[PDB]
Amino acid sequence: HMLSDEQMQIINSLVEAHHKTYDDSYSDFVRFRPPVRRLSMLPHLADLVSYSIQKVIGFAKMIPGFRDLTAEDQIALLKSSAIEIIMLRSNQSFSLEDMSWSCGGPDFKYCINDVTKAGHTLELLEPLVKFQVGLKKLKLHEEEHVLLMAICLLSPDRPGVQDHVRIEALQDRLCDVLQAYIRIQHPGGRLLYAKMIQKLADLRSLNEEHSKQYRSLSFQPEHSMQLTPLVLEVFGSEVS
Amino acid sequence: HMLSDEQMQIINSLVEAHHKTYDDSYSDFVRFRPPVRRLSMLPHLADLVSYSIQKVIGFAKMIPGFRDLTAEDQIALLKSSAIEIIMLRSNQSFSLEDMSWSCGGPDFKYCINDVTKAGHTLELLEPLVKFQVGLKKLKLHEEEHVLLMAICLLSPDRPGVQDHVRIEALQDRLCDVLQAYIRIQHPGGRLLYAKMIQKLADLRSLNEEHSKQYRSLSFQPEHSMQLTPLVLEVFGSEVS
């Protein structure tokens, strides 16, 4: 009926980790190749994604226990989950009014139409936007949002993970925290935990569709040359 | 005492090739990651170099005979010579008044100090700037400038070339053209051909120093991640 002290330490650590790696001013965005509105938005969006991967790495490194995993497992988790975390963390900039991600100025407002000009199709972008509004409607506390990113990251059912038992134990601890937080601190959240778990299922489907469409980009050198080295590494298919 | 018809065809082809691949308006530069003045200029200069490599490829493809070389030889010539051609072609933006490369607006004016903020040292930048002023003082006709870029590109003494005899024959033809052009069309150019050949020697030394310093960048992943895929490919050490 009350959160334990070690549970709230986990929440505090995760909130601080997200605050250190998510800059609400979006002032770094001016450093990206500018947006252009065939794949006119691919340079800007490639830089946005590459920048966001670095932030997700920085967040991962501050999840309790992640840094104690083997380097291979840390990479395996990041390679399969980075795109899902980007999709989850982007909900903070998503607007129900505009049906778009608004990152400060109008140059950094991203429509569905912008993302099609980076090589993606409605097969991905329709479920992605439905995901964003459903997630936005959940009205998650910051505590819950960061717990869900951490649970997503620490999923043991990813290709290439070795220490399955250690990662599942870590994820189990985080799920316990989130269930207890919702029950005690979220008024009217009786169905919230189940909804959040469903969103993790949705992200798997979005992950699959994104990887399919990314393979088309990466197989065409005039497009893949527009990506960044970090995007090529993380979204690529090399195995450790 | 007069240029032959096949010699002036070569000149015409090369001039047209340079005009198609060198845009004097510099309007594409706004598409690069913006300049920032530790290696604050590395993103902008990486994009400038990557863009310039694409132009040098496009110029190479229009040199008579280059496209008839094997793909491996085309790559070998481009990998060893791209940095020299960039240094040669950049003389068009170099200003004796400012001791700098001025590409339209003041955001795209590059000092020696700008290039140090991309990871290079005076060991490279001092000889590079002395090279630019000496080359600028030669006051080359456009015909001569483009011939020298083509002769530079078509050098058979590069690591990894296979069809040495074919490439040297091509370069010999271009040298004959340039010697004849200077003699007939360049008043007071008795010593010009020798000076231009010396500049090719200077570029070898600049190439060596650049490759040495590039190896330092490329061995540090926080810097190499700022490069482009094309720069990593062309300036890298992989062999076909």
């Binding site: 670095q54 790495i57 490194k61 380097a71 840390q74 990479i75 990041l78 390679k79 080295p229 970090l230 590494e233 993380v234 090399e238 450790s240 | 992943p221 926080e222 190499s224 991640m225």
Partner: peptide, 10 residues
């Protein structure tokens, strides 16, 4: 392999 990832993971 995964040169940048290793570096970013410290």
């Amino acid at each position: 392999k995964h040169k940048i990832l290793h570096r970013l993971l410290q």
